Every structure is written in structure tokens, then in C-alpha cells.
């Protein structure tokens, strides 16, 4: 709410440095794994310095301090830092017991700080504001945001709830609160375009998003809220004796993607990410081959078969204009221009460029990154059918 001037930002730097000092206490014995508070906060400091360096003169700084997202970000960073400091003070010697509730609260705060850092990097890439140019991954989700919010970067939860409810009914106030805790990754009662992108990637397809979220997160005993890689390994340790035990949660290092942890034969805990592949299918195939059998160690494993009818790949119709164009080149529009062999059957999101799945898979398998045609991050894909003009 307050204007984020240079003075207000530096105040956050002090609070953050104190939190870092508190976390550098040898007695904590924090593990060097994401989310790692001793990485996140100095990295947050660096990115805020970068932002200030791009907004150098008086006019730019006044502009920066009036940026809606940035005001909210700075205020959240301030609140969360004070919360962290408060945690150590009241927590006392409980901070040194891993199993305590106070440490769990530190782990939660670390996740939030990690989510915030990834957010400010997406919104202020290279320290310059690009929030109004952010590209939502899923086309239908992108269109929803543009219709109700235009190019806004961030909106109050209450406003977001109303607009979402207009398109996808929220059944109760209780469902709304649960929905808020899932999408509000930074825990600031606002919904950023970045959080909206993560939520819609995780729970696609958009057409039945709230139904998907209910089946995958609300009524599924496998779903773990705000857990880390280490917490998953620790939680599943109780079920080392029962192979097939599995849980899933949001990946911390690859936001918008799922991490599935499972107990193997015999006894070891592994975690995997089905990269940009729908979780429903991954759980179905995992259950079929006897890998994911006991969600959170429980006896019954839910059947998700056909709980997501794929709204059949929207056909793209090669126009006469294009046909003639590729004809003048001795080629066709439909042909994949990477292999020159198969036809285009996948659309890369958010850039929209087309190629075949075989080449996309081969590209990513060879450690290649970004769309071949524009280098934009491949945040999602949609299967498509190109109908030949012939």
C-alpha cells in the first residue's frame, strides 16, 4: 500500500539481512537444497539491487515506487521478513528441533520467499518491469485474464474470485478458501499473473479447471500442500516398508510443474517430474505399471480414468493463401520444418509455434531448450491436427 521509494526498499534489505543472520546460526543445520533460505534472500537482495539500478533518476524511481505490483511485493517482503524474525524470537530453542512446528513455519516461509523470488524475476526480468507483457501459457487461461484484467500484473483475491466464479462456479465459501490457499503461492491475498500461470499450468485443461483441482488436490490423499523435496522424502520414510507409496506436490525449482515422490522396490524414495505432461495421465500410467499404488501410504488408490475427456485437439485449417505459399516453395504448411518428415502435430506455448512431437521430444532429450523458432521458453504444449488444404 505504501509507495516503494528507495528508502522503503533499503529498509527491507535490513530486515532480510537479519533473517539471513538468524538462519546462519550453526544450530539450525539447514540442508543445502531448494528452497534454501541462505540462497533465496541474498538472491532476492541482488535482484532488488538490479531493479534499482535500472530505475536510476528521480522520474524513473517515482514511477517504480508507484508500480502496483512492486508496492505489493515490497510490502509482502517486509511483512514476511518481520514474521521470520518473530518466528525465531518466540520460537526460541524450538528452532533447533527439526520436527517442531516453528521449524515447519520456517520451511513454509522459505517456500514463500522462493516463490516470491521466481515471481519478481518473471515480472522484472533483468530488473526492468515487464509485468504488462507477461505471456500466460495456456491459451484459454490467457484469454480469461485478458478479458477480465487486461494487461494488469496483479489483482486482489476478492476481485479474482468474482471473475473466476463468473466462468467457473465456485460451490461454497469453504471451497473458495481452499482454492485461495492453492493459487495464492506468495500468501499475500493478491493474485499475480505469474501465480495464475502456475495454477492453470498445474490444473489444465482450463475448461474443467476447478473440477481437475478438486480431483487432484482437494479429494486426493496424494496431494501435499507446500511441501519441499526434503519433506517429501521424510514423510515417505514412514512408508519405506510399503513400496508403491506415493505423494505429489508443486515442484519448487520448476514452478508450474508436478513432482511425484514414490517408494520403489525395494525401499528407496525417488522423485520425478513429468515435464509439461498432464498429471492425470501420469498418475494413471504410474498406477497401471504398479509404481503409484498407495497415495500417502493409504490402501485405496483413486481411479482418475476418463475424469478428463480431452476436448479433442482444435483443428487448424490450412488456408488457401498458405497452401499456395508453401506450394511456391515446393513444400506444405502441414510439414514439420525441423525433420521435414512428419507433419506438425504439437503447438508450443505460449509462443504458438508448431512442429511434430518427435522433434520436440528429440530436441529436449538432447538438452536443447526453448522453441526452435523463437527461443521462447517451452512452458506448455497442446496436441493439434493440421488439416491439409488438399
Amino acid at each position: 500500500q505504501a509507495a516503494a521509494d528507495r528508502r522503503t526498499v533499503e529498509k527491507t534489505w535490513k530486515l532480510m539481512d537479519k533473517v539471513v543472520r538468524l538462519c546462519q546460526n550453526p544450530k539450525l543445520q539447514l540442508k543445502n537444497s531448494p528452497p534454501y533460505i541462505l540462497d533465496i534472500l541474498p538472491d532476492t537482495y541482488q535482484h532488488l539491487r538490479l531493479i534499482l539500478s535500472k530505475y536510476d533518476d528521480n522520474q524513473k524511481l517515482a514511477q517504480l515506487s508507484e508500480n502496483e505490483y512492486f508496492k505489493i511485493y515490497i510490502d509482502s517482503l517486509m511483512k514476511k521478513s518481520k514474521r521470520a524474525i518473530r518466528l525465531f524470537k518466540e520460537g526460541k530453542e524450538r528452532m533447533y528441533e527439526e520436527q517442531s512446528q516453528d521449524r515447519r513455519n520456517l520451511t513454509k516461509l522459505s517456500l514463500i520467499f522462493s516463490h516470491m523470488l521466481a515471481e519478481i524475476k518473471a515480472i522484472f526480468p533483468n530488473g526492468q518491469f515487464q509485468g504488462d507483457n507477461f505471456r500466460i501459457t495456456k491459451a484459454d487461461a490467457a484469454e480469461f485474464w485478458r478479458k477480465f484484467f487486461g494487461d494488469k500484473t496483479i489483482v486482489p483475491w476478492k476481485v479474482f474470485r468474482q471473475c473466476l466464479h463468473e466462468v467457473h462456479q465456485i460451490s461454497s465459501g469453504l471451497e473458495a478458501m481452499a482454492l485461495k490457499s492453492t493459487i495464492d503461492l506468495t500468501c499475500n491475498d493478491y493474485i499475480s499473473v505469474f501465480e495464475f500461470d502456475i495454477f492453470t499450468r498445474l490444473f489444465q485443461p482450463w475448461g474443467s479447471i476447478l473440477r481437475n483441482w478438486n480431483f487432484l488436490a482437494v479429494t486426493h490423499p496424494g496431494y501435499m500442500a507446500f511441501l519441499t523435496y526434503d519433506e517429501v522424502k521424510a514423510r515417505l520414510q514412514k512408508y519405506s516398508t510399503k513400496p508403491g507409496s506415493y505423494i505429489f506436490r508443486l515442484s519448487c525449482t520448476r514452478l508450474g510443474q508436478w513432482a511425484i515422490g514414490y517408494v520403489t522396490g525395494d525401499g528407496n524414495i525417488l522423485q520425478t517430474i513429468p515435464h509439461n505432461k498432464p498429471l492425470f495421465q501420469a498418475l494413471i500410467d504410474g498406477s497401471r505399471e504398479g509404481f503409484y499404488l498407495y497415495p500417502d501410504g493409504r490402501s485405496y488408490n483413486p481411479d482418475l480414468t476418463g475424469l478428463c475427456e480431452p476436448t479433442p485437439h482444435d483443428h487448424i485449417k490450412v488456408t488457401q493463401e498458405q497452401f499456395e505459399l508453401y506450394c511456391e516453395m515446393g513444400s506444405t504448411f502441414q510439414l514439420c520444418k525441423i525433420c521435414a518428415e512428419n507433419d506438425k502435430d504439437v503447438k508450443i506455448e505460449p509462443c504458438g509455434h508448431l512442429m511434430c512431437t518427435s522433434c520436440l521430444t528429440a530436441w529436449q532429450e538432447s538438452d536443447g531448450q526453448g522453441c526452435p523458432f523463437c527461443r521462447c521458453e517451452i512452458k506448455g504444449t497442446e496436441p493439434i491436427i493440421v488439416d491439409p488444404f488438399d
Binding site: 537444497s33 531448494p34 523435496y229 513432482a259 520425478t272 513429468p274 504410474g286 505399471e289
Partner: peptide
């Protein structure tokens, strides 16, 4: 490494 292994198949 990140601690993530290939999908079980």
C-alpha cells in the same frame, strides 16, 4: 543434479 530422476516406466 536436482534430485529428480526419470519417470518410472
Amino acid at each position: 543434479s536436482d534430485g529428480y530422476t526419470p519417470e518410472p516406466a
